[PDB]
Amino acid sequence: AKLETVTLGNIGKDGKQTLVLNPRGVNPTNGVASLSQKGCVPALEKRVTVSVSQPSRNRKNYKVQVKIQNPTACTANGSCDPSVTRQAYADVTFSFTQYSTCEERAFVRTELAALLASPLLIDAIDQLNPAY
Amino acid sequence: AKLETVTLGNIGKDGKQTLVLNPRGVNPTNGVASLSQKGCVPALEKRVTVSVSQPSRNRKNYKVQVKIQNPTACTANGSCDPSVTRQAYADVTFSFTQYSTCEERAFVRTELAALLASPLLIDAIDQLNPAY
Amino acid sequence: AKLETVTLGNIGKDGKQTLVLNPRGVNPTNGVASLSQKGCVPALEKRVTVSVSQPSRNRKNYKVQVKIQNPTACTANGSCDPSVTRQAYADVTFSFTQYSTCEERAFVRTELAALLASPLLIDAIDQLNPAY
Amino acid sequence: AKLETVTLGNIGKDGKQTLVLNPRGVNPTNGVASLSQKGCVPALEKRVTVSVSQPSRNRKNYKVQVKIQNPTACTANGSCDPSVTRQAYADVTFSFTQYSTCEERAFVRTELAALLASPLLIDAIDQLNPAY
Amino acid sequence: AKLETVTLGNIGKDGKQTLVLNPRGVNPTNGVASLSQKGCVPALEKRVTVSVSQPSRNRKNYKVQVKIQNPTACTANGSCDPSVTRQAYADVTFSFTQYSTCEERAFVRTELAALLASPLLIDAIDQLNPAY
Amino acid sequence: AKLETVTLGNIGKDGKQTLVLNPRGVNPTNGVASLSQKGCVPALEKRVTVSVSQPSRNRKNYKVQVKIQNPTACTANGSCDPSVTRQAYADVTFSFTQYSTCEERAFVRTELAALLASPLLIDAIDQLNPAY
């Protein structure tokens, strides 16, 4: 769809933070759609990735792979220019047979989107308690 | 977390569907929290798996990996019982540094959620139209 | 130019059918413009692909390659969801020296166009009789 | 499939030029048809070869192939007779199975017909602008 | 961004010269754009492409590469049509750290541009002269 | 020619910035000049060199190479004295045939200079953006 300024809202632990993204160049070599929170320095803005890929000789089914990468900056700590101390990744790769329906896919798209709102996934991420 | 029956509503391209998930067993051996729908016949229940893997004795970062596996039965296959003509995977794998805050994780949590409802991911999943 | 919903009119043996295609991204790994009949389930819709290529190491002349495939469905069987029983590849690869004129190429373009309607090609494409 | 004086009309970008072709025999060991512009000198005349191929045992499918060859020349270069300076290949090959209907084939023929007159194809052939 | 026509003005040795540029897609199977003065003769077009290279962990550096490829024709030469007799290239590579600022870069952009107008580079590019 | 002070003016993102350059001999054991803003601290000087390479029968092409090397300081950093934290390069190579004309070259000189002021290269160098 239209490579557009994405405006993600009602997010964060409280559901009250927002994020504006800017379509930073389709392709870069490998058909990976990139975005970022526009900023001066690059290695400080958070990024995303969308990468649709059709079935190959070796690979037979469709694969939609979305990546998220958020860093963590550290300012005037002796130097003058900020620096990074950790990049909190996030990665999801879907998979769909050639014979899937639009209702069959949007199911997974929304089943996960609502799953991240479960009282299990939150405690299994926000606190990293496993499953019991 | 509280591994009770997990409900998931307002899902699908319709947005007016709902899914039940019953706590069908934890650790097979991999720490895999395994879930399923109300199912008498196994190979037809839609499943999810949630995994918290502590830093090993060789790798440092955490890994929260959730997987989703939904089938598609063929009931009127002529023969007794139905059969599955296609699965439809989904694999999200997180990464966090030992110095991540819950607010740094829960951010990454909510970002992906609202992202799955974004107009681009819809066309990139429900329709498989890539970086247009 | 603009990769838009290219309507395709007056086609078929009766010339009274009509195909409609839609933009479906590009560059999976080789810069292929991809068009498709808009159907919900993939491997059931008639695709069209087109590619341009500036000449390179071995390739010393510009090449344009259009590929056409139309699947054939089959309602049922001893199963439910429709199945594909036979494809129908159509492959045309142009070639021009680094010196051709837009009057030189458009000749070959309109020529092969107007050629797919001669009694020879009609009787060798629809009925498949060699030329005697 | 009578190999007579095949005549092509409304050709060229202006859609008003006209081309003749003449039965330059059949089967030069390769079982290919041959047509050539009204030329008493060979290499300076435009060719067209139409070939059908029954399904052997190295390939299960039929393959009708057409090979348009339009050479460009210039007389007042350095002699008293013209010399071919650049050609213009255009290879097209179809593929059908033993279970294709006549319309099933003619569809592909007529689909490619108006395709070569699309606004998309012309910009990528006459001016070589790829997918935009 | 918006790959579009560039109206490059007040150029040449004097300054009354002016150039028109047009897009030629944006992929050419390696992330480079493709720009050319609208000449229907393909090799006679003055080329200009731009590329942006995400810092592949191969090497941790952003990289933007502009190349200019201008040919010279030979009207009569030998045959009717002209021929290229010498293409004068021009290649520009920039490198910026993952912590560069859009004022740090824009400086280098403007510095180089304003530098080509120096009497040194004029007497060093045009009449080809080192320094003393 | 006369390796001397260059008063590079009206540069930077805005245009109020202005740079002073001074010679540093002309040999540095490889034909390149050496220019540096008169900073007594040696590594903190912004570098610029120019070279002219006679077409060694190794390869029959004249070649003029300009390189720009600008560093960024870190005042406090750790110790009393500052330290370089990232040098942003810039490298330009031209090539001309033994039959190029000083209007053919001066064109490429001015064309490149006037090109860096394009909105494309601005949005492609500064905010780092490919094209679409």
- Cα angle D61, D64, D66 (rounded to 5 degrees) comes to 155
Residue C63 to residue E33: CA distance in whole angstroms: 18
CB contact under 8 A, C27 and E27: yes
Q: Which helix (H) or strand (E) holds B13?
A: none
Distances (CA, A) of B102 to A91, A128, D128: 18, 9, 53
State whether C101 and E29 contact (CB < 8 Å): no
- Kindly determine whether residue C42 and residue A27, on different chains, have CB atoms separated by under 8 Å: no
E86-96/C17-23 β-pairing: unpaired
Q: Tokens 């192939």, residue?
A: D65
Helix (H) / strand (E) element for D103: namely helix D102-115
Tokens of A116: 């991240």
Residue A27 in contact with residue A14, Cβ under 8 Å? no
CB contact under 8 A, F122 and E106: yes
End-to-end CA distance of chain D: 41
A88 neighbors B104 (Cβ within 8 angstroms): yes
Provide CB contacts within 8 A for C58, sequence distance 6+: none
- The answer to whether E28 faces chain C, any CB pair under 8 Å, is yes
Which candidate, B90, E68, E86, places its Cα nearest to that of A64? B90
Q: Which two tokens stand for residue E61?
A: 């550096």
Residue A21 domain-assigned (yes or no)? yes
CA distance linking residue C60 with residue D119, whole number of Å = 27
Chains B and D touch (3+ CB pairs under 8 A): no
What own/partner pairs with CB < 8 Å and gap ≥ 24 does D9-15 have?
A: D9/C114, D10/C110, D10/C114, D11/C107, D11/C110, D11/C111, D11/C114, D12/C103, D12/C106, D12/C107, D12/C110, D13/C102, D13/C103, D13/C106, D13/C107, D13/C110, D13/D126, D15/C110
Distance CA E63, CA A42 (A): 13
What crossing angle do the helices spanning A102-115 and B102-116 adopt, rounded to 10°? Answer: 160
Q: Do E125 and F106 touch (CB under 8 A)?
A: yes
Domain region containing A58: 6-127
Q: Is E115 helix (H, G, I), strand (E, B) or coil?
A: helix
> Which DSSP string do the residues of F76-130 spell out, in sequence order?
SSSSSS----EEEEEEEEEEE-TT--HHHHHHHHHHHHHHTTSHHHHHHHTS---
Asked if residue D86 lies in contact with residue D67, where contact means CB atoms within 8 angstroms, the answer is no
Domain count, chain D: 1
Contact list, F62 vs chain E (CB under 8 Å) = 128
Contact criterion met (CB below 8 Å) for E121 and F108: no
Contact flag E98-A42 (C-beta cutoff 8 Å): yes
- Please report residues of A whose CB lies closer than 8 A to that of F78: 78-79
Give the list of residues 6+ apart from residue C117 with CB closer than 8 angstroms, or none.
Answer: D113
Burial level of C80, CB count in 10 A (0-12/13-18/19+)? middle
Q: Does E57 touch chain F (CB under 8 A)?
A: no
E28 — contact with chain D (CB < 8 Å)?
yes
Closest CA to F68 of F53, F88, F86, F83: F88
CA-nearest residue of chain C to D4?
Answer: C120
The residue length of chain B stands at: 132
To the nearest 10 degrees (0 to 180), the angle between helices E102-115 and F102-115 is: 160
Which residues touch F53 (CB under 8 Å, ≥6 apart)? F31, F62, F63, F64, F65
**CA proximity to A6, closest of B120, B131, B111, F128:** B120
Report the candidate in A52, B130, D123, D131 with the shortest Cα–Cα distance to residue C50. D131
Assigned token pair, B87: 């699965």
Residues of E whose CB is below 8 A from F117 = 113
> Is some CB atom of chain A closer than 8 A to the CB atom of C80?
no
**CATH number of the domain bearing residue C89:** 3.30.380.10
Structural contact between residues E22 and E42, judged by C-beta atoms closer than 8 angstroms: no
Q: Is residue B87 part of a domain?
A: yes
Q: B83 burial class (0-12, 13-18, 19+ CB within 10 angstroms)?
A: middle
**Dihedral angle computed from the Cα positions of residues C117, C120, C126 and C127, in that order, rounded to the nearest 10 degrees:** 160
Closest of C45, C70, B75, B69 to residue A98, by C-alpha: C45
In a domain, residue B105? The reply is yes
Residue at E1 is within a domain: no
How distant, in Å, are the alpha carbons of D76, E39, F61 from that of E74? 15, 15, 20
C-alpha span between F95 and F1 (Å, rounded): 19
A26, A42, A80 member nearest F132 (Cβ): A26
Phi then psi dihedrals of residue E46, to 5 deg: -70, 125
Q: Is F84 on the interface with E (CB under 8 A)?
A: no
C101 and chain E: CB distance < 8 Å anywhere?
yes
Nearest-angstrom CA–CA distance, B95 and E92: 38
| Chain E residue with the nearest C-alpha to that of D82 | E79
- D5 by Cβ neighbours in 10 Å (0-12 / 13-18 / 19+) ranks as exposed
Cβ–Cβ contact E18 with F under 8 A? no
Smallest CA-to-CA distance from B66 within B87, B106, B93 is with: B93
Q: Which residues pair with B50 in a beta bridge?
A: B33, B66
For tokens 């394009």, name the residue. F118
Task: Report the distance separating Cα D72 and Cα D83, nearest Å.
Answer: 9
For residues F71 and F44, the answer to whether their CB atoms sit within 8 Å is yes
Nearest to A24 by CA among C85, C53, E52, B25: E52
From the list C26, C29, C42, the residue facing A62 with the nearest CB is C42
What distance in Å separates the CA atoms of residue A81 and residue A33, rounded to the nearest whole number? 29
Helix, strand, coil in percent for chain B, rounding step 5 = 20, 30, 50
Q: CA of D96: how far to CAs of B3, D51, D130, F118, in Å?
A: 56, 14, 28, 51
Distance from CA of E18 to the nearest CA of D (A): 23
Which two three-digit tokens encode residue D10? Answer: 């409304």
- Given E28, E34, E81, which is nearest C99 (Cβ)? E81
Residues 6+ apart with CB under 8 A from E108: E94, F68, F70, F88, F90, F125
Rounded Cα gap, residues D52 and D27, in angstroms: 11
Does D1 map to a domain?
no
CA atoms within 13 A on the CB side of D6: 28
Residues sharing a CB contact under 8 Å with residue D44, sequence separation 6 or more, in sequence order: D71, D73, D82, D84
Resolution in angstroms, to 1 decimal, for this deposition? 3.9
Q: Is C26 on the interface with E (CB under 8 A)?
A: yes
Q: Is there a contact between A80 and F76 if contact means CB atoms under 8 Å apart?
A: yes
Note whether residue B116 is domain-resident.
yes
For residue F124, the Cα-to-chain-centroid distance in whole angstroms is 18
Question: CA of C101, closest CA in chain E: separation in Å?
Answer: 5
Name the residue in chain B with its Cα closest to that of C24. Answer: B129
Per the CB < 8 A criterion, the answer to whether D90 and C96 are in contact is no
> B25 in contact with A at a CB cutoff of 8 Å?
no
- The answer to whether residue E129 is domain-embedded is no
- CA neighbours within 13 Å on the CB side: how many for A77? 7
Which residue, chain included where needed, has tokens 């047009």? E22
Cα separation, B93 vs D126, whole angstroms: 48
What are the respective helix, strand and coil percentages of chain E, to the nearest 5? Answer: 15, 30, 55
Distance CA B86, CA F68 (A): 58
Are E45 and F89 contacting, i.e. CB atoms less than 8 angstroms apart? no
The structure tokens listed for F98 are 């033994």
C10 touches chain D (CB under 8 A): yes
User: Would you call D132 an interface residue with chain E, using a CB distance cutoff of 8 Å?
Assistant: yes
Q: Residue A94: enclosing H or E segment and its boundaries?
A: strand A88-94
Q: Do C101 and E40 touch (CB under 8 A)?
A: yes
The burial class, CB within 10 Å (0-12 / 13-18 / 19+), for B54 is exposed
The two tokens of residue E78 are 């030998």
Return the closest-CA partner of residue C132 out of D44, D32, F64, B34: D32
Q: Which letter does DSSP use for residue A29 in this model?
A: T
Q: Which residue of A28, A41, A83 is in closest CB contact with E54?
A: A28
- Distance, CA of C27 to CA of C51 (rounded, Å): 10
Q: Are E108 and F70 in contact (CB under 8 A)?
A: yes
Residue E38 lies in a domain: yes
CB-hemisphere CA count at 13 Å for C101?
10
